[PDB]
Amino acid sequence: QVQLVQSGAEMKKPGASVKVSCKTSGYTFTNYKINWVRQAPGQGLEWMGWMNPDTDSTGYPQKFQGRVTMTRNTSISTAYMELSSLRSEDTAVYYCARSYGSGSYYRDYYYGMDVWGQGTTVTVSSASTKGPSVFPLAPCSRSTSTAALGCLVKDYFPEPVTVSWNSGALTSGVHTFPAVLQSSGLYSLSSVVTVPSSSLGTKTYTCNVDHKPSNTKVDKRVES
Amino acid sequence: EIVLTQSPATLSLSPGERATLSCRASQSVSSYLAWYQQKPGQAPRLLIYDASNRATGIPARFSGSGSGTDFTLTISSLEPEDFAVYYCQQRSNWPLTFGGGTKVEIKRTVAAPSVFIFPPSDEQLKSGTASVVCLLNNFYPREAKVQWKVDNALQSGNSQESVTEQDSKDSTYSLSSTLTLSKADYEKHKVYACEVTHQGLSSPVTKSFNRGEC
Ligand SMILES: [Cl-]
Ligand SMILES: [Cl-]
Ligand SMILES: [Cl-]
């Protein structure tokens, strides 16, 4: 059975390059083309070219001429895509995807991209690894309904951040928001929970914030 | 290069209804047209290749039609799994281009938001920055105005916001807005407010608090 497994998230300074690998299994590597397709946060999809592992041929849209290189090692069934001269607009998720190989009557365009790797988030920024600081979000008093509390996870890099509540035991009512990119180059997000008022002074609410790229975890108590 | 236009970009429909999605190409692409489906955090999935052939294992409620310039993808009756983004992709001429995507979202009864406001913490004031958060919880449709007032002064461009995907259980949206001020700015004013406008309330709702009078 068919899988494409790509390598882990990377972060890069502008000017540098990135090489993403794609290990295939469940099929004859040498009989299908490999495609690379990227997607920028919030945006659509952009084909970056393809390669035939069988013949070692490559082809790239003009957009990417000189910047993309695709290579393969047949012995370990893995494809590679390198992108150079990175700019912050190259920040995207990169996918490898497989399509039917040569070729009988353009069948390589006839069929589409049927199996995809899980994606690899590449981040180009001049920022540097930094853990978040977590601040509480609490109402101004215990009002005269239902209430809401939260965690503000400010100033970290890179993505992602995971947040649970009371060590995962609190699920119903949680909204964890997509991170925003701040103009300082650092990310920020908030996570909130709606609970009935009658329970405020009676149970503790903690949020659990994990940022694996900086290796930091923070349990933060919220109250009013 | 061939440009593909998808109409409309957004579609709101109930489970069970048919969906009709349009892909227009700037020049002819014969029948080399593919559709993909994508859900958040997931790789795209092939549905249709060569304009009208279903990919292996794709269920029969999807079918596509058209050739040359105008193409339709039809989802004959919508299941919860079918609310996603759909992309078309032309495969006649380099570079293989994708359209901008149509988002198929769930339609439900209008629901007013609950509004909450949070002052910056004392923890955070020690740094010389203040973040004030406003929360709009559980509303439908997606359109909402949030307005920041500080001592009646409207604040424009010093706040960022984001919105959750449509909610698993009740198809609602939620929104978080962060107004950031320097500590000096924050300490110099007294009233902070969050005014939100939404289809579900016949009157603009305001939540405020008084600095240091909390
Ligand atoms: Cl070789
Ligand atoms: Cl399905
Ligand atoms: Cl004062």
Author numbering:
A (entry chain H): 1 to 144, 147 to 226
B (entry chain L): 1 to 214
Authors' own words:
Although the electron densities of the central part (Ser102–Tyr106) of complementarity-determining region (CDR) 3 of the heavy chain was unclear, the final model included the heavy (Gln1–Ser226, excluding Ser102–Tyr106 and Ser145–Glu146) and light (Glu1–Cys214) chains, one N-linked sugar chain at Asn73 of the KMTR2 heavy chain, two sulfate and three chloride ions, and 42 water molecules. The overall structure of KMTR2-Fab was conserved regardless of antigen binding, with an RMSD value of 1.17 Å for all main chain atoms. There were some interaction residues between each CDR2 of the light chain; however, its binding mode was quite different from that in complex with TRAIL-R2.
The assembly and trimerization of TRAIL-R1 and TRAIL-R2 are prerequisites for transducing an apoptosis signal. KMTR2 can oligomerize soluble TRAIL-R2 fused with the Fc region of IgG (ecTRAIL-R2:Fc) and clusters membrane TRAIL-R2 on cell surfaces without cross-linking, inducing the death of human tumor cells in vitro and established tumors in vivo.
